[PDB]
Amino acid sequence: KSMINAYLDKLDLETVRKIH
C-alpha cells in the first residue's frame, strides 16, 4: 500500500460522500 492506498481514499470519499 504505497501508491494504491492514496488513490482509493479520494475515489470512494468523493463518489458516495462529496456533499454529505
Helix boundaries (H) for 1-20: 4-15
Rounded Cα–Cα distance for residues 20 and 5 (Å): 22
Instruction: Give the angle subtended at the CA of 19 by the CAs of 15 and 20, to the nearest 5°.
Output: 95
Q: Greatest CA span in the chain, whole angstroms?
A: 28
Experimental technique for the deposited model: NMR
DSSP state of 16: T
Grid cell, residue 1, equals 500500500
CA distances for 14 relative to 2, 5, 8, angstroms: 21, 15, 10
